[PDB]
Tab-separated table of C-alpha atoms in Angstrom:
chain	number	residue	atom	x	y	z
A	1	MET	CA	121.985	82.933	103.020
A	2	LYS	CA	120.625	84.317	106.285
A	3	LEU	CA	117.660	86.603	106.718
A	4	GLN	CA	118.435	89.168	109.417
A	5	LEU	CA	115.793	91.520	110.860
A	6	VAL	CA	117.479	94.670	112.265
A	7	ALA	CA	114.884	96.430	114.336
A	8	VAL	CA	114.708	99.199	116.826
A	9	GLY	CA	113.430	98.269	120.280
A	10	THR	CA	114.051	95.714	122.971
A	11	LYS	CA	111.640	94.013	125.373
A	12	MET	CA	108.699	93.525	122.980
A	13	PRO	CA	105.379	92.596	124.553
A	14	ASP	CA	105.330	88.906	125.408
A	15	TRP	CA	102.640	88.120	122.791
A	16	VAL	CA	104.853	89.731	120.125
A	17	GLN	CA	107.905	87.763	121.291
A	18	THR	CA	105.864	84.582	121.172
A	19	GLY	CA	104.265	85.150	117.773
A	20	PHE	CA	107.556	86.352	116.302
A	21	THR	CA	109.342	83.239	117.564
A	22	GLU	CA	106.655	80.931	116.277
A	23	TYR	CA	107.400	82.059	112.710
A	24	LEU	CA	111.141	82.317	113.133
A	25	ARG	CA	111.220	78.697	114.387
A	26	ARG	CA	109.762	77.470	111.056
A	27	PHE	CA	112.890	78.354	109.116
A	28	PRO	CA	115.230	75.408	108.520
A	29	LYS	CA	118.924	75.149	109.266
A	30	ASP	CA	119.787	76.086	105.705
A	31	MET	CA	118.110	79.498	105.914
A	32	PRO	CA	118.868	81.110	109.251
A	33	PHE	CA	116.321	83.727	110.374
A	34	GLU	CA	117.774	86.068	113.006
A	35	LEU	CA	116.885	89.211	114.935
A	36	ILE	CA	119.113	92.096	115.959
A	37	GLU	CA	117.586	94.601	118.297
A	38	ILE	CA	118.879	98.213	118.335
A	39	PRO	CA	118.216	100.196	121.496
A	40	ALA	CA	115.546	102.869	121.104
A	41	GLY	CA	116.875	106.323	121.979
A	42	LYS	CA	115.303	108.018	125.026
A	43	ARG	CA	113.193	110.963	123.953
A	44	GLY	CA	113.064	113.349	126.965
A	45	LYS	CA	111.630	116.876	127.129
A	46	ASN	CA	114.501	118.594	125.414
A	47	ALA	CA	115.473	115.620	123.215
A	48	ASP	CA	117.094	116.295	119.862
A	49	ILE	CA	114.784	114.130	117.827
A	50	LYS	CA	116.817	114.349	114.600
A	51	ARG	CA	120.046	113.293	116.441
A	52	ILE	CA	118.385	110.321	118.278
A	53	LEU	CA	117.015	109.010	114.969
A	54	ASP	CA	120.388	109.443	113.271
A	55	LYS	CA	122.035	107.411	116.074
A	56	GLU	CA	119.413	104.611	115.777
A	57	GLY	CA	120.037	104.481	112.040
A	58	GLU	CA	123.847	104.522	112.446
A	59	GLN	CA	123.551	101.459	114.751
A	60	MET	CA	121.189	99.720	112.331
A	61	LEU	CA	123.480	100.248	109.430
A	62	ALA	CA	126.509	99.048	111.460
A	63	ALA	CA	124.632	95.823	112.236
A	64	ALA	CA	123.678	95.228	108.586
A	65	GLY	CA	127.326	95.520	107.501
A	66	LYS	CA	127.834	94.386	103.914
A	67	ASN	CA	124.416	92.679	103.614
A	68	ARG	CA	121.710	93.526	101.083
A	69	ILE	CA	119.732	96.300	102.796
A	70	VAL	CA	115.959	96.081	102.455
A	71	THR	CA	114.004	98.689	104.379
A	72	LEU	CA	110.478	98.267	105.643
A	73	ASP	CA	108.948	101.636	104.780
A	74	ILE	CA	105.333	102.671	103.945
A	75	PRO	CA	106.417	104.149	100.480
A	76	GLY	CA	108.242	100.939	99.482
A	77	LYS	CA	107.140	98.304	96.960
A	78	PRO	CA	103.684	96.896	97.908
A	79	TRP	CA	104.747	93.359	97.059
A	80	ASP	CA	102.069	90.672	97.015
A	81	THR	CA	102.993	87.222	98.292
A	82	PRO	CA	104.038	85.728	94.924
A	83	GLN	CA	106.176	88.815	94.392
A	84	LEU	CA	107.823	88.407	97.805
A	85	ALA	CA	108.545	84.768	97.017
A	86	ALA	CA	110.185	85.873	93.743
A	87	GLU	CA	112.276	88.451	95.645
A	88	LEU	CA	113.364	85.808	98.174
A	89	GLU	CA	114.597	83.748	95.175
A	90	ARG	CA	116.293	86.804	93.773
A	91	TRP	CA	118.105	87.463	97.080
A	92	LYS	CA	119.838	84.051	96.779
A	93	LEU	CA	121.573	84.909	93.542
A	94	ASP	CA	124.349	87.296	94.625
A	95	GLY	CA	125.421	85.341	97.692
A	96	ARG	CA	124.905	87.997	100.402
A	97	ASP	CA	122.838	87.767	103.573
A	98	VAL	CA	119.870	90.104	103.696
A	99	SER	CA	119.140	92.623	106.418
A	100	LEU	CA	115.540	93.860	106.730
A	101	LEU	CA	115.450	97.193	108.503
A	102	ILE	CA	112.492	98.185	110.693
A	103	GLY	CA	112.466	101.669	112.211
A	104	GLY	CA	111.117	102.627	115.617
A	105	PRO	CA	108.169	104.949	116.223
A	106	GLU	CA	109.810	107.933	114.405
A	107	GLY	CA	110.728	105.833	111.348
A	108	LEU	CA	113.905	105.187	109.546
A	109	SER	CA	116.759	107.685	109.607
A	110	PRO	CA	117.761	109.550	106.466
A	111	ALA	CA	120.972	107.459	106.175
A	112	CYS	CA	118.935	104.238	106.267
A	113	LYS	CA	116.708	105.507	103.418
A	114	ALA	CA	119.779	106.532	101.385
A	115	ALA	CA	121.356	103.071	101.957
A	116	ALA	CA	118.271	101.008	100.990
A	117	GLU	CA	118.863	98.696	98.044
A	118	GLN	CA	115.189	97.819	98.032
A	119	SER	CA	112.290	98.987	100.097
A	120	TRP	CA	109.151	97.050	100.978
A	121	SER	CA	105.696	98.352	102.071
A	122	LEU	CA	103.501	96.009	104.022
A	123	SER	CA	100.454	98.200	104.004
A	124	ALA	CA	99.186	101.694	103.366
A	125	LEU	CA	98.417	101.861	107.088
A	126	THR	CA	100.823	103.239	109.690
A	127	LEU	CA	101.782	100.050	111.507
A	128	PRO	CA	103.286	99.828	115.015
A	129	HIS	CA	106.783	98.461	115.012
A	130	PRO	CA	106.133	95.357	117.217
A	131	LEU	CA	103.446	94.150	114.865
A	132	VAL	CA	105.700	94.886	111.879
A	133	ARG	CA	108.253	92.393	113.223
A	134	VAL	CA	105.578	89.667	113.384
A	135	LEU	CA	104.281	90.516	109.910
A	136	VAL	CA	107.748	90.387	108.387
A	137	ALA	CA	108.480	86.993	109.950
A	138	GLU	CA	105.148	85.510	108.878
A	139	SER	CA	105.275	86.903	105.365
A	140	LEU	CA	108.855	85.756	104.818
A	141	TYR	CA	107.844	82.374	106.140
A	142	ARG	CA	105.014	82.296	103.675
A	143	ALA	CA	107.411	83.214	100.911
A	144	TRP	CA	109.772	80.496	102.052
A	145	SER	CA	106.932	77.952	101.925
A	146	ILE	CA	106.164	78.967	98.324
A	147	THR	CA	109.843	78.824	97.172
A	148	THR	CA	110.214	75.358	98.750
A	149	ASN	CA	106.866	74.000	97.605
A	150	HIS	CA	105.432	73.303	101.040
A	151	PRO	CA	101.859	73.790	102.125
A	152	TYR	CA	101.384	76.659	104.536
A	153	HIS	CA	101.510	75.580	108.155
A	154	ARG	CA	98.709	77.163	110.306
A	155	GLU	CA	99.302	76.297	113.939
B	1	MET	CA	78.040	102.752	117.667
B	2	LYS	CA	79.697	99.332	118.219
B	3	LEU	CA	82.432	97.792	116.048
B	4	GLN	CA	81.984	94.021	115.723
B	5	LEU	CA	84.498	91.719	114.137
B	6	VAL	CA	82.701	88.652	112.618
B	7	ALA	CA	85.484	86.202	111.938
B	8	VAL	CA	85.848	82.552	110.985
B	9	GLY	CA	87.831	80.402	113.370
B	10	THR	CA	87.763	79.305	117.004
B	11	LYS	CA	91.293	77.956	117.379
B	12	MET	CA	93.356	81.089	117.816
B	13	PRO	CA	96.607	80.649	119.695
B	14	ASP	CA	96.895	82.479	122.988
B	15	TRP	CA	99.480	84.932	121.635
B	16	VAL	CA	97.100	86.097	118.894
B	17	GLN	CA	94.218	86.407	121.333
B	18	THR	CA	96.400	88.328	123.730
B	19	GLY	CA	97.571	90.778	121.057
B	20	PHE	CA	94.038	91.118	119.751
B	21	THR	CA	92.547	91.881	123.098
B	22	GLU	CA	95.524	94.255	123.910
B	23	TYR	CA	93.881	96.573	121.388
B	24	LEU	CA	90.228	95.605	121.820
B	25	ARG	CA	90.425	96.643	125.460
B	26	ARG	CA	91.606	100.140	124.589
B	27	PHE	CA	88.340	101.182	122.981
B	28	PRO	CA	86.331	103.427	125.231
B	29	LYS	CA	83.045	102.520	126.786
B	30	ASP	CA	81.188	104.694	124.244
B	31	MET	CA	82.551	102.689	121.278
B	32	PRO	CA	82.511	99.045	122.191
B	33	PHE	CA	84.744	96.698	120.103
B	34	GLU	CA	83.483	93.073	120.068
B	35	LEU	CA	84.275	89.704	118.523
B	36	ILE	CA	81.979	86.972	117.229
B	37	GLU	CA	83.744	83.750	116.101
B	38	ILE	CA	82.097	81.603	113.440
B	39	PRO	CA	83.127	77.905	113.388
B	40	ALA	CA	85.158	76.933	110.367
B	41	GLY	CA	83.517	74.336	108.150
B	42	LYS	CA	85.154	70.890	108.095
B	43	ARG	CA	87.131	70.538	104.864
B	44	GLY	CA	87.129	66.735	104.603
B	45	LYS	CA	88.274	64.598	101.755
B	46	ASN	CA	85.198	64.891	99.600
B	47	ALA	CA	83.741	68.178	100.861
B	48	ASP	CA	82.747	70.957	98.438
B	49	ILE	CA	84.682	73.967	99.426
B	50	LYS	CA	81.957	76.162	97.812
B	51	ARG	CA	79.294	74.736	100.086
B	52	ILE	CA	81.517	75.014	103.141
B	53	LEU	CA	82.169	78.597	102.329
B	54	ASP	CA	78.498	79.367	101.646
B	55	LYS	CA	77.629	77.963	105.068
B	56	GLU	CA	80.354	80.028	106.851
B	57	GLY	CA	78.948	83.049	105.028
B	58	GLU	CA	75.322	82.415	106.029
B	59	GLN	CA	76.465	82.307	109.632
B	60	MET	CA	78.611	85.444	109.243
B	61	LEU	CA	75.719	87.374	107.656
B	62	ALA	CA	73.305	86.166	110.336
B	63	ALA	CA	75.724	87.524	113.017
B	64	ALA	CA	75.976	90.848	111.207
B	65	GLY	CA	72.250	91.419	110.960
B	66	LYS	CA	71.296	94.883	109.830
B	67	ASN	CA	74.790	96.307	110.592
B	68	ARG	CA	76.900	98.210	108.075
B	69	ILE	CA	78.996	95.466	106.503
B	70	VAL	CA	82.652	96.030	105.749
B	71	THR	CA	84.584	93.023	104.425
B	72	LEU	CA	88.319	92.505	104.807
B	73	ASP	CA	89.260	91.239	101.300
B	74	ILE	CA	92.487	91.588	99.280
B	75	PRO	CA	90.708	93.548	96.410
B	76	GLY	CA	89.329	96.085	98.888
B	77	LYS	CA	90.311	99.727	99.375
B	78	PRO	CA	93.983	100.094	100.440
B	79	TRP	CA	93.085	102.647	103.123
B	80	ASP	CA	95.908	104.552	104.795
B	81	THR	CA	95.581	105.542	108.466
B	82	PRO	CA	94.142	108.987	107.764
B	83	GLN	CA	91.580	107.530	105.289
B	84	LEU	CA	90.666	104.893	107.969
B	85	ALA	CA	89.987	107.713	110.456
B	86	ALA	CA	87.776	109.388	107.829
B	87	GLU	CA	85.907	106.115	107.381
B	88	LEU	CA	85.391	105.825	111.115
B	89	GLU	CA	83.857	109.354	110.957
B	90	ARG	CA	81.555	108.159	108.115
B	91	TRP	CA	80.535	105.107	110.094
B	92	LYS	CA	79.691	107.265	113.074
B	93	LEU	CA	77.354	109.451	110.988
B	94	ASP	CA	75.476	106.353	109.748
B	95	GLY	CA	73.883	105.328	113.068
B	96	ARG	CA	74.296	101.580	112.617
B	97	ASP	CA	76.792	99.366	114.253
B	98	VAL	CA	79.588	98.114	111.958
B	99	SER	CA	80.393	94.484	111.304
B	100	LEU	CA	83.825	93.744	109.874
B	101	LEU	CA	83.846	90.327	108.178
B	102	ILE	CA	86.990	88.204	108.139
B	103	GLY	CA	87.027	84.891	106.289
B	104	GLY	CA	89.326	81.960	106.764
B	105	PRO	CA	92.194	81.085	104.338
B	106	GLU	CA	89.674	80.112	101.667
B	107	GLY	CA	88.090	83.542	101.864
B	108	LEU	CA	84.577	84.962	101.787
B	109	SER	CA	81.504	83.557	100.176
B	110	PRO	CA	79.835	85.295	97.186
B	111	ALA	CA	76.877	86.270	99.451
B	112	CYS	CA	79.245	87.991	101.904
B	113	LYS	CA	80.971	89.883	99.088
B	114	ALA	CA	77.616	90.886	97.692
B	115	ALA	CA	76.494	92.058	101.141
B	116	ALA	CA	79.544	94.281	101.656
B	117	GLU	CA	78.832	98.008	101.679
B	118	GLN	CA	82.585	98.650	101.690
B	119	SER	CA	85.662	96.435	101.379
B	120	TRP	CA	89.047	97.054	102.994
B	121	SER	CA	92.484	95.663	101.971
B	122	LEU	CA	95.129	95.731	104.699
B	123	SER	CA	97.958	94.604	102.399
B	124	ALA	CA	98.939	93.244	98.970
B	125	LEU	CA	100.277	90.237	100.892
B	126	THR	CA	98.187	87.224	101.695
B	127	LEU	CA	97.854	87.715	105.439
B	128	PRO	CA	96.905	84.910	107.803
B	129	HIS	CA	93.580	85.168	109.600
B	130	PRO	CA	95.059	85.634	113.100
B	131	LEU	CA	97.131	88.592	111.996
B	132	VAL	CA	94.180	90.089	110.209
B	133	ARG	CA	92.254	90.136	113.520
B	134	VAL	CA	95.151	91.847	115.330
B	135	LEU	CA	95.732	94.314	112.461
B	136	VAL	CA	92.024	95.273	112.268
B	137	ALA	CA	91.872	95.922	116.026
B	138	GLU	CA	95.091	97.984	116.143
B	139	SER	CA	94.443	100.018	113.011
B	140	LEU	CA	90.952	100.915	114.037
B	141	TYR	CA	92.268	101.863	117.510
B	142	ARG	CA	94.775	104.075	115.755
B	143	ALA	CA	92.038	105.647	113.678
B	144	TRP	CA	89.872	106.130	116.809
B	145	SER	CA	92.829	107.870	118.540
B	146	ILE	CA	93.142	110.310	115.601
B	147	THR	CA	89.441	111.121	115.804
B	148	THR	CA	89.574	111.911	119.517
B	149	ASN	CA	93.033	113.574	119.675
B	150	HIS	CA	94.427	110.793	121.891
B	151	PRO	CA	98.311	110.591	121.695
B	152	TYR	CA	98.797	107.042	120.416
B	153	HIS	CA	99.350	107.947	116.702
């Protein structure tokens, strides 16, 4: 089973790219952790905001294919770390890869919300998408460490 | 008013520091945002974690002085961004600087918890210290931006 982050935006700040990678690199060969970046739509003066968001979401859903769709969304389940570890174990059972969907600054499209099999809230706060990527990688790493009975690695 | 993060640990990786100061630097000259690092106690083979923690806490509380003390702790208030902006408005009315206390992985001492005037939970998840520093700086920036009608949020 692979864990696939499907996220809007390319060219993250270098510190985000570095921190993100540092967690991603912890995952072993038997649990691939991968990133798909969806281009952010350009929002000019007369932009159709609803249409741009729908296109972002269409691309995200295309990338997720037949995977289990978990959205990152502020109204989702406020899982604690033991809970997230239990969900990671649960994700193994049906054989699918898992796509974790992170929206851009205007959030997830309606189609992405309708498609969500599960939804996960990291915080009550409105978080910026680059930081969300890092938080998802770290927290999934932490969950991996719990499911595999390894001490947490603080670099 | 100043915001002062009082945080255990002196070994942050450059990427964490960089992200942290990406937000720290955005605060305006009239609301300085500062960091004070407290050394982590050595957790050797026969060390009493309670004593190590008590010592971190004494140093954290000495750094905070007479400031309003807000602890970052998982049982704290799960503030949303609007509520965090409202808290920033409350802090401003107080007159005192604010110290935001961030423990290491073993947490905060009983004296620090007892000294907290408010406590703030960022997440149900067990977040690592470095990401707590970045999250505190960004979220408070966000809240500041709401209070001043700056476009960031």
